[PDB]
Structure formats: structure tokens, C-alpha cells
Design a protein around this ligand. Structure first.
Ligand SMILES: O=C1O[C@H]([C@@H](O)CO)C(O)=C1O
Length: 239
């Protein structure tokens, strides 16, 4: 699991796919994430509907992987519905700066909600943030996040973590097929990236960045080629 976000280094993002056989798709796959999201190339699909979530507050652990901080839910944290297929919410990864761009703009943080169906299909819902008012979700975790920095520990019980504190506006999003954004960069992942940009405070991002290894202080994978794949867009009109 040594990989780095330092461009130019032997273990850096351009080389991920040559580091070990298990990571080859990082270099050779053609539906890699993240990508550029461009309004002028989207296919509109009114048929997708408002994003259908039913999430539940539940017991969680915070983990420092060394290259990101994530929330790891212990109980059943509820689920996301796409095409009446149901995907359970398992984890939330944090990346600063953002990995996705929207019309050429890179944001200050991205949160990625990883879900898994019983069929084991994967869907990720991404939220993009600009510096502003604190994020209510991270507020309730700040003192736990701090402990990665004021101590030796790399897991922490965060108790009950509520995903309905997340800044998700269900009325508009992008949708496309992609990959995990870190090794093993596996494909077949449905991505939903929320149009509405949330806010997070600088203090909150700093806490996150304090937590990780040095080679991961910025932990965004560079944008990958779109390669002609389709990008769908839904947006609910006032009518
Ligand atoms: O699609 C994803 O890739 C990231 C990974 O880069 C985390 O470090 C993750 O877990 C996702 O939600």
C-alpha cells in the first residue's frame, strides 16, 4: 500500500499503475476517475429523478489510512436507490483539494460516499465544497479528527455519526461511469457528483490535512481522460 500523490515521484500518480500488478488498471483502464465535468458536454436525462437516499444515523469509526481520512460505518447507515437497485452506505472518504472539477473549477474539499449493493455493485456520491461556513457533519467529528494529530492512533470510535448532516442537495447532479480514485482504481463504479457546492471551514480542512502522511497532504488524484464516455446530468426544474 505505498502510493504517493507527489507528481514526479517514483510512487506518484502517473506511476501507480506500474507499482504492483494489482494496481494495473490505474495505468491501463479507460474509465478512470476523477474527470472534468462540463455542462456543455452533458446528456440531459430528466428521467433520473431527484437523488433517492434513505440514510440512517449509526455507530461509526474514523480511520486514518495514511493517505486519507474516512468515516467507516459499523451499523447499517441506510442506503441509496438508483433504478430501484439499493446500495448501502459503507464509508465516506475526504480529499483536499477536490478530485472532480466542474467547468474547470477545482474545489477545496470533496467528500465521497461509497455504497455497495447486495449484488456488490458500487456507487459513489460525491459532494464538492468551497471555503465558507463550517460543515455541520465535520463539526461533530472535529475533536475525533484532531486525535490523529495529537496522538499515535489510526482508528477512533466516533460513536454515532449522522449522514443526514451531509450537505446534499438532491435536485441536481452529474452521473457517469468511473473508477475508484486510489489504487486499485477498479472500474464499474457509478459516480454521482452533486451540482450544489457545499461549504467547509478552513479550520476543518486543515484538521484533515494534519492527519495524513506527508506525501498525501494534498490527496487528489489528477484528472483522468474522459475518453468519450458519456456524462449524464439531472436537474429538477421549478416546473
Ligand atoms: O471512488 C473512490 O476512490 C476513493 C479513494 O481514492 C479513497 O482514498 C474512494 O474511497 C472513493 O469513494
Amino acid at each position: 500500500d505505498e502510493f504517493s500523490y507527489i507528481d514526479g515521484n517514483p510512487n506518484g500518480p502517473e506511476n501507480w499503475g506500474n507499482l504492483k500488478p494489482e494496481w494495473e488498471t490505474c495505468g491501463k483502464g479507460m474509465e478512470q476517475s476523477p474527470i472534468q465535468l462540463r455542462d456543455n458536454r452533458v446528456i440531459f436525462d430528466q428521467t433520473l429523478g431527484k437523488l433517492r437516499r434513505n440514510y440512517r444515523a449509526v455507530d461509526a469509526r474514523l480511520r486514518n489510512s495514511g493517505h486519507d481520512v474516512l468515516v467507516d460505518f459499523k451499523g447499517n447507515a441506510g442506503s441509496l436507490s438508483i433504478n430501484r437497485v439499493e446500495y448501502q452506505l459503507k464509508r465516506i472518504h475526504f480529499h483536499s483539494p477536490s478530485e472532480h472539477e466542474m467547468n474547470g473549477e477545482r474545489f477545496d474539499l470533496e467528500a465521497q460516499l461509497v455504497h455497495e449493493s447486495q449484488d456488490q455493485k458500487r456507487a459513489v456520491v460525491s459532494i464538492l465544497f468551497r471555503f465558507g461556513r463550517a460543515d455541520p457533519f465535520l463539526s461533530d467529528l472535529e475533536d475525533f479528527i484532531k486525535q490523529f494529530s495529537n496522538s499515535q492512533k489510526n482508528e477512533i470510535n466516533a460513536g454515532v455519526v449522522d449522514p443526514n448532516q451531509l450537505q446534499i442537495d438532491d435536485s441536481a447532479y452529474y452521473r457517469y461511469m468511473g473508477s475508484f480514485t486510489a489504487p486499485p482504481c477498479t472500474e464499474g463504479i457509478s459516480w454521482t457528483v452533486m451540482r450544489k457546492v457545499a461549504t467547509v471551514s478552513p479550520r476543518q480542512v486543515l484538521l484533515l490535512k494534519q492527519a495524513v502522511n506527508e506525501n498525501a497532504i494534498n490527496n487528489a488524484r489528477p484528472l483522468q481522460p474522459t475518453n468519450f464516455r458519456s456524462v449524464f446530468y439531472f436537474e429538477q426544474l421549478k416546473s
